[PDB]
Symmetry: C2
Subunit: 182 residues, 2 copies
Amino acid sequence: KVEMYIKNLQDDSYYVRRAAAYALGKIGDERAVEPLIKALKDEDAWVRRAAADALGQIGDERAVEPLIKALKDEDGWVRQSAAVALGQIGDERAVEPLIKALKDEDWFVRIAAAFALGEIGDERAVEPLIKALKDEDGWVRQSAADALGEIGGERVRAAMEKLAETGTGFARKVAVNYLETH
Amino acid sequence: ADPEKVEMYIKNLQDDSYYVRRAAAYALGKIGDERAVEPLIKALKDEDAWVRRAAADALGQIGDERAVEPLIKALKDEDGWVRQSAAVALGQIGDERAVEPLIKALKDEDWFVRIAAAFALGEIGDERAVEPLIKALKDEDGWVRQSAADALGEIGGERVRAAMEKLAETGTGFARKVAVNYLET
């Protein structure tokens, strides 16, 4: 029963809270939303990440600001799942925090931020995602390219024309392909 | 990803630009049209790690048995993240031929692969994973420790209960914590 789990989320055994979190997500009702938001502050990083992940699957906008704060979690993997969850939700309040996350320490979270930014589809990400095309990590470059395509639209096309004309390297290839394929 | 472009994407799996091959593999995964099965299997051999991974992930989603032997080979990829997707994919497909290879992936040098292998083994539910997973409770990584417990959970049954009984008696650390909890519940 979700209220058992909702209560389990406070158990002394991190092993039990871990199980609660993962569960409240697979079978998530709105009842689970507020408890899970509290679990984003759990001592155990696993619990945090399972909570971020659940809340994304639930889709309730109440989690938006609490997740935005998790984009600053000590653990890179929970930041990763926060970014993804924000993407899923996907409230436009996440946009600017997610754009800041494009410069995260961990490549795997920069990928998540680009992906989320693309899912949300707010053109504010266009310029930051273009800069992300010159990221030191080749897989986040890739994820920045994919996100731009997911966003689509006039500002992206315009930004791509710019790059096709005077840009270079991966960015140029991305832009030439973009307008080739539209 | 445009469902009406499958044939284009398939062609694109052989494009000169890794960028176009990546895009193609990823698209066929979202689609996900059974026509892409043998071409995605071919993409498991691409020079580019991103496209191999994209390919492994796509094959798992489609669920075609043909992808099993090739994904098994992919568990020996030099890139840990394609190994991870290969493991995940093999769990999704559920074909029992993956059980022994996934058992050996329990000892992968990369923690995130061990986690994927543990999870797949629990999804397949084959009981030869019980003792390997029990040993995995002693993994140096706390997260792969966790995934082996969850996996043993999903497998359940008499053999697992039996092994849990023993750990409650003589086990130590997290493995002990897990067994006594398995009993309590």
